[PDB]
Backbone:
């Protein structure tokens, strides 16, 4: 039993084989080197190499061709898969059949559009995928297009200071099964400032208090350990009836997943 990865994550017992990938993908091979053990390795501080790994895994394991810039966040695939499988568990996906269409929202989808591409590819899930950043929007839209998934994934550029509520008016589906979200990167006064991550997820909580049963589950993936406790307390204060959380990692890269619901 793994403590780092979701039980159904394909990389849980089959980690990426860099020698295999280098043998097959010349664009990947040019970014690898040999370590002191004589093993094929990669410099994870180098964005070109990290990009090549992500693009290569998506191609090899998921049949997805993506194009992304060096100047925006490059996602790490094994880590992201944990969140997809966790959402599967939240919504009861393992125990239903294909006749049930699911509808998600990815808040701040990124240049990769990685959550919608994985969810649409693996499960046939629909996504509304929002993005404030122009470059990320443009890339996301092309990545969905080039993988022929625009009937499942609607990529939408949204204004700088809007979130879930603004995205879901008369245009919307009646009920969504979930939202997902990776938050964006961010001796005198005793009180610590909330910081970017806590503030951002509190905005989602605030929107959920309006939308209530229009989404079955609200979720986020947290990058700061210190986020989880205050967000649980804010959900308690507001009387949110169903709260669940879990923890994943990939090596030293740790994440805390938090989800809540107004259903019984
Ligand atoms: Na494969």
Residues:
């Amino acid at each position: 039993l793994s403590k780092s990865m979701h039980a159904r994550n394909r990389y849980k017992d089959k980690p990426p084989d860099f020698a295999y990938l280098a043998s097959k993908y010349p664009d990947f091979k040019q970014h690898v080197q040999i370590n002191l053990n004589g093993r094929v390795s990669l410099n994870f501080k180098d964005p070109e190499a990290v990009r090549a790994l992500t693009c290569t895994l998506l191609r090899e394991d998921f049949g997805l061709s993506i194009d992304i810039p060096l100047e925006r966040l490059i996602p790490t695939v094994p880590l992201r898969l944990n969140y997809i499988h966790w959402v599967e568990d939240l919504i009861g996906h393992q125990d239903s059949d294909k006749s049930t269409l699911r509808r998600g929202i990815d808040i701040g989808t990124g240049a990769s559009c990685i959550y919608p591409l994985l969810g649409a590819t693996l499960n046939g899930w629909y996504f509304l995928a929002t993005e404030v950043d122009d470059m990320c929007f443009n890339y996301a839209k092309k990545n969905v297009e080039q993988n022929n998934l625009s009937d499942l994934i609607k990529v939408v550029k949204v204004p700088q200071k809007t979130l879930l509520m603004d995205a879901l008016k008369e245009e919307s589906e009646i009920i969504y099964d979930f939202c997902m979200c990776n938050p964006p990167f961010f001796g005198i006064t005793e009180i610590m400032a909330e910081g970017g991550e806590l503030e951002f997820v509190k905005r989602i909580i605030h929107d959920s208090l309006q939308l209530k049963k229009r989404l079955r589950w609200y979720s986020c993936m947290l990058g700061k350990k210190c986020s989880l406790a205050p967000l649980k307390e804010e959900l308690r204060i507001q009387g949110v009836p169903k709260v669940t959380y879990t923890e994943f990692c990939q090596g030293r890269t740790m994440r805390w997943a938090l989800a809540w619901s107004f259903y019984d």
About this structure: The chain has one domain: 1-264.
